[PDB]
Coordinates of C-alpha atoms in Angstrom, one line a residue:
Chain V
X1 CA 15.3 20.8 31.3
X2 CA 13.1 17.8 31.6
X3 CA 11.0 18.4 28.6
X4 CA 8.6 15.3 27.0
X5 CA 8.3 17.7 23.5
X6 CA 11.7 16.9 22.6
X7 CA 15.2 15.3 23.0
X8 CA 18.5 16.7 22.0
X9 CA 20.3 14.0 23.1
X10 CA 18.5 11.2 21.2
X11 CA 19.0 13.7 18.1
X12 CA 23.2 13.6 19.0
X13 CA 23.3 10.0 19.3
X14 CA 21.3 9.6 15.7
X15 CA 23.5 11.8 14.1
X16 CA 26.8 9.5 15.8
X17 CA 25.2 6.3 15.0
X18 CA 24.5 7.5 11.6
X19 CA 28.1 8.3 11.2
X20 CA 29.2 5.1 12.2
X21 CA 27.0 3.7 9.9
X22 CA 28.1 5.5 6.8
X23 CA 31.7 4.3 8.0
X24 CA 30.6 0.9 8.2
X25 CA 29.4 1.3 4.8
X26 CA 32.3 2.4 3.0
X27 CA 33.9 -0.2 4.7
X28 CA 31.6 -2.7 3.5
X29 CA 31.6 -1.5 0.0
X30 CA 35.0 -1.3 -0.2
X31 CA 35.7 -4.8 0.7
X32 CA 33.2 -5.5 -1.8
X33 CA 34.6 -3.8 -4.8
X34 CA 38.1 -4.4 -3.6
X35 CA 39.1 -0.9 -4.3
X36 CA 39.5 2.3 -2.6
X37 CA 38.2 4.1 -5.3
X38 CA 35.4 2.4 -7.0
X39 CA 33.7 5.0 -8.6
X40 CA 34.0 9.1 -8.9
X41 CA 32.6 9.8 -6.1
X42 CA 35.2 8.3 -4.2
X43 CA 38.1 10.1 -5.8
X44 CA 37.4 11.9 -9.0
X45 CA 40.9 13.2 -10.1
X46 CA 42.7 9.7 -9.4
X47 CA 39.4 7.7 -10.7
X48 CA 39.8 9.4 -14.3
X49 CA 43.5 8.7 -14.6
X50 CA 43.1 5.2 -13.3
X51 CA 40.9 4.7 -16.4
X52 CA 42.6 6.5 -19.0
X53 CA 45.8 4.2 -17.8
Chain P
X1 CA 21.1 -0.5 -12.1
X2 CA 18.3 1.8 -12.8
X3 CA 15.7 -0.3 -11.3
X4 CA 17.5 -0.4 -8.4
X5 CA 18.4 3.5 -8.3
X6 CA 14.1 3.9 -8.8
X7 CA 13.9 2.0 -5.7
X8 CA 15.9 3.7 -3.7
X9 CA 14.6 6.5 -4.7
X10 CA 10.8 5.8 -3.9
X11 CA 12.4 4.9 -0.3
X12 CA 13.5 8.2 0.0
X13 CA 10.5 9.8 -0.8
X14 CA 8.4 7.4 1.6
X15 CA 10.2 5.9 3.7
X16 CA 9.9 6.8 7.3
X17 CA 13.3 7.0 9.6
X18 CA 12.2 4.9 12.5
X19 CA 14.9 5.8 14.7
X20 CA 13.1 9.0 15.5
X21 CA 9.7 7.4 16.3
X22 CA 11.5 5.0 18.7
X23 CA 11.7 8.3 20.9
X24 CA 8.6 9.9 19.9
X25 CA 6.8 7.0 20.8
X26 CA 7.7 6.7 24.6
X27 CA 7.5 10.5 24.8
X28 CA 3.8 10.4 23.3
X29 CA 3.1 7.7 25.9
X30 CA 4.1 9.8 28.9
X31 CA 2.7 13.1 27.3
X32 CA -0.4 10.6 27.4
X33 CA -0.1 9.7 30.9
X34 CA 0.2 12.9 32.5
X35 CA -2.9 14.7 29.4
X36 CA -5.2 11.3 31.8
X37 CA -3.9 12.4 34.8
X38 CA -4.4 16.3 34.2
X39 CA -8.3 15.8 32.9
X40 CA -8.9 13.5 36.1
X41 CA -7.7 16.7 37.9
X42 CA -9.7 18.8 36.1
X43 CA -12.6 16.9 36.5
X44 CA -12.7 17.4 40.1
X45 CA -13.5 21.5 40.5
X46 CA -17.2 20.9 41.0
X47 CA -16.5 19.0 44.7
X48 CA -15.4 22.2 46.2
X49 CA -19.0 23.5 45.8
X50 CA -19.8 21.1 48.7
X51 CA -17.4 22.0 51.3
X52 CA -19.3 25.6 51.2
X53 CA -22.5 24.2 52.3
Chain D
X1 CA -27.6 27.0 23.2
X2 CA -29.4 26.0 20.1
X3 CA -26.4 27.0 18.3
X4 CA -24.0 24.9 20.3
X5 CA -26.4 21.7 20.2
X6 CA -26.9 21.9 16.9
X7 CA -22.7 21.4 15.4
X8 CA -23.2 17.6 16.2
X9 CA -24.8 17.3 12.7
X10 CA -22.1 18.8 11.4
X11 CA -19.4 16.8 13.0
X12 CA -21.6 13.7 11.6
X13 CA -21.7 15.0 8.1
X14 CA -17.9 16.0 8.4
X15 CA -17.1 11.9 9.5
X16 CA -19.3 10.8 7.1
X17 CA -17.7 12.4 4.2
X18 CA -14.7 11.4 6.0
X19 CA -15.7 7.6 5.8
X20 CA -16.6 8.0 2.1
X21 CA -13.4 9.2 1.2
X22 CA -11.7 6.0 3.0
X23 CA -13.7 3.9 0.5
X24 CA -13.0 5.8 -2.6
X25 CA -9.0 5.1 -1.1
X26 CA -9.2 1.5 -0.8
X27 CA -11.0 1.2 -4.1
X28 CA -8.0 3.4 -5.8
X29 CA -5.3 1.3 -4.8
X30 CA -6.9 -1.7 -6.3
X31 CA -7.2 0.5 -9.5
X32 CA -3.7 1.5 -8.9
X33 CA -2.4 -2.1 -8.6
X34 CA -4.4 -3.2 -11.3
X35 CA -3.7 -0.6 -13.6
X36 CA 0.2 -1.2 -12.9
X37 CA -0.1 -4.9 -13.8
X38 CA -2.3 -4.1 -17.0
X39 CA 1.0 -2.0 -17.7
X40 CA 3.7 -4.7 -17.5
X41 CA 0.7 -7.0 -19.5
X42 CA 0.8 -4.3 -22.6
X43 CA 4.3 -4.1 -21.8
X44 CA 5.5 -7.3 -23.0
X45 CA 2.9 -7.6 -25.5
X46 CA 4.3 -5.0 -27.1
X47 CA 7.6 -7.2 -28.0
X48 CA 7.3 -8.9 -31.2
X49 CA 10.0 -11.4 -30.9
X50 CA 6.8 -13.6 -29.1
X51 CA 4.9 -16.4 -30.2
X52 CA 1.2 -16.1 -31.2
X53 CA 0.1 -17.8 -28.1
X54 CA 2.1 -15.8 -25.6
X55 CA 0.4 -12.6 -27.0
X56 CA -2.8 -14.1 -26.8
X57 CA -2.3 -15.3 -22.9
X58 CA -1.1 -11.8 -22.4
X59 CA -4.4 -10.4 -23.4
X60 CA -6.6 -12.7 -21.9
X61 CA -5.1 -11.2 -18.8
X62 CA -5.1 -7.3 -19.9
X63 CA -8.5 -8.2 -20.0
X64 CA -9.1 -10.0 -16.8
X65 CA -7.7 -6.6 -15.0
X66 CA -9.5 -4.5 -17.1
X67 CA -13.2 -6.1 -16.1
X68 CA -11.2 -6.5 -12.5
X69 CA -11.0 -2.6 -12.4
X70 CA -14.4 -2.0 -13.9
X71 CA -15.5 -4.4 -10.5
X72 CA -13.7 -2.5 -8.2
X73 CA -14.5 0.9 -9.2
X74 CA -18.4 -0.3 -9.1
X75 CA -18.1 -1.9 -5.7
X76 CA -16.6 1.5 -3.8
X77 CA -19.9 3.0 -2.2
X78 CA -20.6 4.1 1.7
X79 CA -24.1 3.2 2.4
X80 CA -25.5 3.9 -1.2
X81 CA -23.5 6.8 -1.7
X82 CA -19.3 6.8 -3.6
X83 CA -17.4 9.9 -4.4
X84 CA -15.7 7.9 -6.8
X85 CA -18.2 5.5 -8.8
X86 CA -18.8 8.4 -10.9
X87 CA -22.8 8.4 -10.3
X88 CA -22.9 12.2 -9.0
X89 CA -21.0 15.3 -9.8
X90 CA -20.3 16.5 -6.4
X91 CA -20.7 15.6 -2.4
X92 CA -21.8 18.6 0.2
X93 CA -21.1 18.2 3.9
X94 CA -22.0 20.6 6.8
X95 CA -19.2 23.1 7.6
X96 CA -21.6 25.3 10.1
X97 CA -24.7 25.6 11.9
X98 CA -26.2 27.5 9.3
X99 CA -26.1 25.0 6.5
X100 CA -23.1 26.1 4.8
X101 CA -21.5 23.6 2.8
X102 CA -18.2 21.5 2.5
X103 CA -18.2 20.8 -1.2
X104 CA -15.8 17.9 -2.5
X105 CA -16.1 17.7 -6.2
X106 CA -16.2 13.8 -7.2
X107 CA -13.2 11.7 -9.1
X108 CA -14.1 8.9 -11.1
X109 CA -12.3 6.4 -11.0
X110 CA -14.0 4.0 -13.8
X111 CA -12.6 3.2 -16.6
X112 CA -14.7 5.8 -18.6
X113 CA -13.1 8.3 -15.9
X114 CA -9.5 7.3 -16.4
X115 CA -9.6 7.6 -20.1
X116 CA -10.2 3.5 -20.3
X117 CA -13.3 1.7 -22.0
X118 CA -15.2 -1.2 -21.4
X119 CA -14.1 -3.1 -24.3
X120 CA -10.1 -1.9 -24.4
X121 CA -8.0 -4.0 -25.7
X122 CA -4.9 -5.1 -28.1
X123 CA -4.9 -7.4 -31.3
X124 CA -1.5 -6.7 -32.6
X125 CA 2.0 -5.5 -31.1
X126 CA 1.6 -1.7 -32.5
X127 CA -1.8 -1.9 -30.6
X128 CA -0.3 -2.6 -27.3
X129 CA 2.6 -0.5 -28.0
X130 CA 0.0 2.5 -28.0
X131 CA -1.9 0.7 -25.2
X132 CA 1.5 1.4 -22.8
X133 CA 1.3 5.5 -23.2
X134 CA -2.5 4.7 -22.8
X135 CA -2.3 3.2 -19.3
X136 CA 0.3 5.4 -18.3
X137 CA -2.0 8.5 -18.5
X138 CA -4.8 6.0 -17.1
X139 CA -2.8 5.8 -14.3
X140 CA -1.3 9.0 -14.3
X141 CA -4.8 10.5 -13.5
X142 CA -6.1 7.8 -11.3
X143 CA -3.0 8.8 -9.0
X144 CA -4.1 12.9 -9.1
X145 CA -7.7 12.0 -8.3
X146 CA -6.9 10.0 -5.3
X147 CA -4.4 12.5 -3.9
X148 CA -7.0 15.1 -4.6
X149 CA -9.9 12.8 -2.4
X150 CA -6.9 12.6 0.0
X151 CA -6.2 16.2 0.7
X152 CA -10.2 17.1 0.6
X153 CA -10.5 14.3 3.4
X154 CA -7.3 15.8 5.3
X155 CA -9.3 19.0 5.4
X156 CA -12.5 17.7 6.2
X157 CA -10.8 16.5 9.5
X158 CA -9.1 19.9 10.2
X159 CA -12.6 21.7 10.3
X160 CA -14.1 18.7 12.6
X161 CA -11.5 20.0 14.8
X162 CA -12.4 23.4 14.5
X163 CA -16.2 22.9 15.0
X164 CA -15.2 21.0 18.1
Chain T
X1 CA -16.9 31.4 38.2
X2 CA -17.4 28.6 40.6
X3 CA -20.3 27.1 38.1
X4 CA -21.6 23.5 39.0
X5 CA -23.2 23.8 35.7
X6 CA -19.8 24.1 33.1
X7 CA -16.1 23.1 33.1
X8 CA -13.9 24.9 30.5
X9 CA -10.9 23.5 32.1
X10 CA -11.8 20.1 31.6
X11 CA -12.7 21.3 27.5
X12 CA -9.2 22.5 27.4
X13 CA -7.8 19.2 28.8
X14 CA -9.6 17.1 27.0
X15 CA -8.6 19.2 23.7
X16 CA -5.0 19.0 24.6
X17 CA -5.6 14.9 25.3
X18 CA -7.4 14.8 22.1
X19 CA -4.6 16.0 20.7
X20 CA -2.0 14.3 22.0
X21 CA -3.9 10.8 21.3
X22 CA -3.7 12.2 17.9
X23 CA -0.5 12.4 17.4
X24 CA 0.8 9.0 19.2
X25 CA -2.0 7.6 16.6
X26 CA 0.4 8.9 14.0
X27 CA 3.0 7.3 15.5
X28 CA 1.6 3.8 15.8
X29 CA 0.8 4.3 11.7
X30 CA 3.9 5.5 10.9
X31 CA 5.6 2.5 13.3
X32 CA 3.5 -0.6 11.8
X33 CA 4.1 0.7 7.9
X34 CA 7.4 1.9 8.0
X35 CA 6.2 5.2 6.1
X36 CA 5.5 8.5 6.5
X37 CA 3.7 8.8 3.6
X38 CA 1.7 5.4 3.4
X39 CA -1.7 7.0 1.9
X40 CA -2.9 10.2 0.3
X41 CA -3.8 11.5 2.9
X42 CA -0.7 11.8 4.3
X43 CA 0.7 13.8 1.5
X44 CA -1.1 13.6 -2.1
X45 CA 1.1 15.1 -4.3
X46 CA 4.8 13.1 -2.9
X47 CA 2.2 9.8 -2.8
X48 CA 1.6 10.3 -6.5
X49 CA 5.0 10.5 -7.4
X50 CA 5.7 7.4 -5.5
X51 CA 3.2 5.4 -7.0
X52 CA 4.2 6.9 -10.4
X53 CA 7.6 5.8 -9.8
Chain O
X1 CA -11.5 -33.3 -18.7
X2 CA -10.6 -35.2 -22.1
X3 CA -13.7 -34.0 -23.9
X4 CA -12.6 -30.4 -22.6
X5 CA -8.8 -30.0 -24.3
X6 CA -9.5 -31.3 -27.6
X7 CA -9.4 -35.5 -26.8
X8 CA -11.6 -38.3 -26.0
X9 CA -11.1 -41.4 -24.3
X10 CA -10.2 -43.8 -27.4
X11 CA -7.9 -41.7 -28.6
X12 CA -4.6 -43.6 -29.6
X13 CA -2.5 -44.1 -32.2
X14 CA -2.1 -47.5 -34.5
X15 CA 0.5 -46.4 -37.0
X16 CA 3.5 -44.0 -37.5
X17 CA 1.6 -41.3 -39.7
X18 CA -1.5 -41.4 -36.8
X19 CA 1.6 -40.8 -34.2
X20 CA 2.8 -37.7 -35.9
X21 CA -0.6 -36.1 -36.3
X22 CA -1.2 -37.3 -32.2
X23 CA 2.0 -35.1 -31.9
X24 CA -0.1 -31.9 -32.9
X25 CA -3.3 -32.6 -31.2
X26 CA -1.3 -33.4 -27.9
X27 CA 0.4 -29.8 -28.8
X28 CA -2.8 -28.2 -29.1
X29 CA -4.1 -29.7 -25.7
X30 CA -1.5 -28.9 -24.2
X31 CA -1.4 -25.4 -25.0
X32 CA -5.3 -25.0 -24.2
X33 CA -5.4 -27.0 -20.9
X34 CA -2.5 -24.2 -19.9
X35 CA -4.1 -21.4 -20.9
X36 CA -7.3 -22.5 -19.0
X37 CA -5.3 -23.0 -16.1
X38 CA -3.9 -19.7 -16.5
X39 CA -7.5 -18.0 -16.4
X40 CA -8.5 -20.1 -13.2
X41 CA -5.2 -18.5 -11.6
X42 CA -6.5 -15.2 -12.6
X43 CA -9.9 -15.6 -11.1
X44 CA -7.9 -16.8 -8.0
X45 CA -6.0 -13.7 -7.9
X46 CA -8.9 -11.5 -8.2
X47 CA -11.1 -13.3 -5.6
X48 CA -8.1 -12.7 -3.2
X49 CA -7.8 -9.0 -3.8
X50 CA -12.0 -8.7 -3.7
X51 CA -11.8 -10.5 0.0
X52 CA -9.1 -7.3 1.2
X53 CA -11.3 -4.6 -0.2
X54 CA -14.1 -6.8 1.3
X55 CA -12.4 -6.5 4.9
Chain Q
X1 CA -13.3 10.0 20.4
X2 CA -12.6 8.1 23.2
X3 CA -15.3 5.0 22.6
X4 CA -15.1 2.0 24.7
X5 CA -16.9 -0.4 21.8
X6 CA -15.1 0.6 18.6
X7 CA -11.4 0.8 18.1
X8 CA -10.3 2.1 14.5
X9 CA -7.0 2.5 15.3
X10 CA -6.6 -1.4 16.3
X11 CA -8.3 -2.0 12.8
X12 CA -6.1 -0.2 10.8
X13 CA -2.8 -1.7 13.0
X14 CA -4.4 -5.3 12.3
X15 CA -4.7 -4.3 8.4
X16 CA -0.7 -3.3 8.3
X17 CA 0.2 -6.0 10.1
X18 CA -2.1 -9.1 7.7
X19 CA -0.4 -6.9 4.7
X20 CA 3.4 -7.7 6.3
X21 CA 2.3 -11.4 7.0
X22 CA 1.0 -11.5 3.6
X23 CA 4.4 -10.1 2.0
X24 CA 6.1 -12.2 4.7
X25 CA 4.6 -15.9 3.3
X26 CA 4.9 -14.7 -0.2
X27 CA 8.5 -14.3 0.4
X28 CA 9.1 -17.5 2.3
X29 CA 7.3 -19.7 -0.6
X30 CA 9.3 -17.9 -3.3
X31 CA 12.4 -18.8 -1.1
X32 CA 11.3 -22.6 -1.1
X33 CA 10.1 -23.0 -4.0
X34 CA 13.0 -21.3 -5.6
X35 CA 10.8 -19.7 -8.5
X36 CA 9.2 -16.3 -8.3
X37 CA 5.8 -17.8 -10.5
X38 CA 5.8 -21.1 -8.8
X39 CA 2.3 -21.6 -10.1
X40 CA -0.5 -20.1 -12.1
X41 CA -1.8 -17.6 -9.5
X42 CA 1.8 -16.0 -9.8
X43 CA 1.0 -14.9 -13.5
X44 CA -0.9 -16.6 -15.6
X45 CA 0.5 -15.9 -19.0
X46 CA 4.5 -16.5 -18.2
X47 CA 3.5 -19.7 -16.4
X48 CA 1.8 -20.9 -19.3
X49 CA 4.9 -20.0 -21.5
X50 CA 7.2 -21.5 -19.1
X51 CA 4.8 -24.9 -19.2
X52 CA 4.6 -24.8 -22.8
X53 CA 8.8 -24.3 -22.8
Chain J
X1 CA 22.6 -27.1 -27.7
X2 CA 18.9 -26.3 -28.6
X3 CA 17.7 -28.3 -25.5
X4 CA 20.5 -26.7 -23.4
X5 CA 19.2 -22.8 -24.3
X6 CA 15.5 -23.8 -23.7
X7 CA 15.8 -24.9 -20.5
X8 CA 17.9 -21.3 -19.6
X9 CA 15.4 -19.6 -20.7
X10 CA 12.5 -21.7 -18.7
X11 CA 14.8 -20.4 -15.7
X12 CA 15.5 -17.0 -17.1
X13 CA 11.3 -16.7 -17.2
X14 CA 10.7 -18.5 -13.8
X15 CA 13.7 -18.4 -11.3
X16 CA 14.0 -16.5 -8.6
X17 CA 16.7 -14.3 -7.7
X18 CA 16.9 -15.6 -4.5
X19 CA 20.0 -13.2 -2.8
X20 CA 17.4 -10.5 -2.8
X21 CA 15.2 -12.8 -1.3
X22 CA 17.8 -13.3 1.6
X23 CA 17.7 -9.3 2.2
X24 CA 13.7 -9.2 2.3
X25 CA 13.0 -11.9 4.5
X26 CA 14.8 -10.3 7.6
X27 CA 13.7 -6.9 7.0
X28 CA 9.6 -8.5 6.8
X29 CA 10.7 -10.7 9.9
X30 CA 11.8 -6.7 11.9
X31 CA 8.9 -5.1 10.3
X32 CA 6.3 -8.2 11.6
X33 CA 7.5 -7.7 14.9
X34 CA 7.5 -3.8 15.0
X35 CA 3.9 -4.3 13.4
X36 CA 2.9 -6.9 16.5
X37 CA 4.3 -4.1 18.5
X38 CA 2.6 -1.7 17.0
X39 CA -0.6 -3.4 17.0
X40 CA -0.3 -4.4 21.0
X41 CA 0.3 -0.5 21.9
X42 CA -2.5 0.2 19.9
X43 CA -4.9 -2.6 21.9
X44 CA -4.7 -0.6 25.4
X45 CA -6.4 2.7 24.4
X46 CA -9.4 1.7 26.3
X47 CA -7.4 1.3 29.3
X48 CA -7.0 5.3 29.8
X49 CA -11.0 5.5 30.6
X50 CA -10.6 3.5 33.9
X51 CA -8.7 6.5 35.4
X52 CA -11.1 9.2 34.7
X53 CA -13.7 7.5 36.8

């Protein structure tokens, strides 16, 4: 397969590279906010009994 | 907050995702190449004509 | 053969229109641009916690952008002729040999065509409070009329490709 | 058809160049703005909303 | 210019009552030599954005 | 259209790019300066209340 | 006190926020060279004539 229409393995290493990024920006954020769980969507269940303690 | 949440969203909208283009532009390029070198082929039927007389 | 010669007027009329529309697109995102700023002007004029002279430099520049927009609405002609300056009702271009048309209705984009006057203003707060909803739908339709002139000119491409 | 007069192969060619010059022309846009949708022409009703927003 | 925001050029002040009425006339020059410099940035503005449609 | 005199695409890559320069200085003169309405060309009406403050 | 909340508000009207500033200046700076970029691939379209001939 030596097509010039398209590239499957440019497409795999976009969807890796995007997952390192969202890693690297949980990371980020989380160093940030200086929680694990800063919001909802990072843990609902514990999030709404943090704030009710 | 919600300025910044009406910008992001306008960058989804909009926003291109260059990564991809980074390929699609050196595929475009070669897909150029060989369209210039197929019509200089093409070009060339009519000197057959000569060998014949 | 007469047939096959005779598509290159087409194909100018189809570039032409083409070029016409690119006018009409530059001239709209002035509008837009101006019309945005004219909003945040109305917008804090609106407040009424300013002073008398803050209003009044607040409308002196409402209605710089207003005669700025009247300008470039006026200035966005091809060679005599603007699908947008609001002088004709429609534009026809060649879509075949045999004369058929391409019709692209026009879209003004004055300000008598966005809903806008001449002389629009604000004297008090409850004026430019009203004057905010105004220049929203101003720009509300200024934004459908350009993506109309857009997808008419995206067409007008797709059948020069055809007639080639 | 060994015409000296007409060369359909060189119309296709120079359709399927045509084409592809086309596309890398889209490309180079969507490259130097950093948007997919930088006009109305690209897409009027998304460029509406943008603007709007 | 003095002439244009309200002055002149003997303008002054020779007692205490004549310095507290100078305090409003340099308030009102003030506040029209601003504004007119405001509608000069204006024009500026607009020239610039008349040169890109120009282009 | 494959002209050897004009070049529309060159045009429209010079417009995007004087756009991006222009951003670009506007940006590097509100970094300097510190202000975003360093002077009356900024806006007119808040510079004249921030004069008059 | 008087003089004190004046002056914050002269720099509540005029200052720039300038840790957004820090964020725009190096994406402009990537998007002025992809646009350069952009702009040189888009200089060499004449080049493809010289092979057809």
């Amino acid at each position: 397969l030596n097509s010039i229409n398209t590239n499957a393995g440019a497409m795999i290493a976009l969807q890796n590279l995007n997952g390192t990024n969202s890693e690297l920006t949980t990371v980020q954020q989380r160093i940030n906010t200086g929680k694990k769980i800063a919001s909802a969507k990072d843990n609902g269940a514990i999030w709404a009994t943090a704030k009710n303690q | 907050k919600l300025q910044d949440s009406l910008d992001a969203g306008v960058g989804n909208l909009v926003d291109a995702d260059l990564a991809k283009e980074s390929a699609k532009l050196q595929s475009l390029q070669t897909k150029q190449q060989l369209g210039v070198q197929a019509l200089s082929i093409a070009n060339q039927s009519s000197s057959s004509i000569l060998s014949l007389f | 053969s007469a047939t096959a010669a005779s598509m290159n007027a087409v194909k100018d009329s189809l570039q032409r229109g083409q070029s016409t529309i690119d006018v009409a697109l530059a001239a709209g995102d002035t509008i837009t641009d101006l019309l945005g700023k004219m909003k945040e002007k109305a917008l804090a004029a609106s407040d009424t916690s300013l002073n008398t002279a803050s209003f009044n430099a607040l409308k002196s520049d409402f209605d710089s952008l207003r005669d700025q927009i009247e300008k470039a609405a006026t200035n966005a002609k091809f060679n005599g002729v603007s699908i947008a300056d609001g002088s004709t009702t429609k534009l026809t271009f060649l879509a075949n040999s045999d004369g058929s048309g391409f019709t692209v209705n026009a879209k003004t984009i004055s300000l008598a065509g966005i809903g806008l006057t001449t002389t629009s203003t604000f004297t008090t707060a409850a004026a430019a409070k009203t004057m905010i909803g105004t220049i929203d739908t101003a720009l509300q339709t200024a934004t459908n009329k350009l993506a109309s002139l857009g997808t008419s000119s995206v067409g007008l491409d797709t059948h020069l490709t055809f007639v080639g």
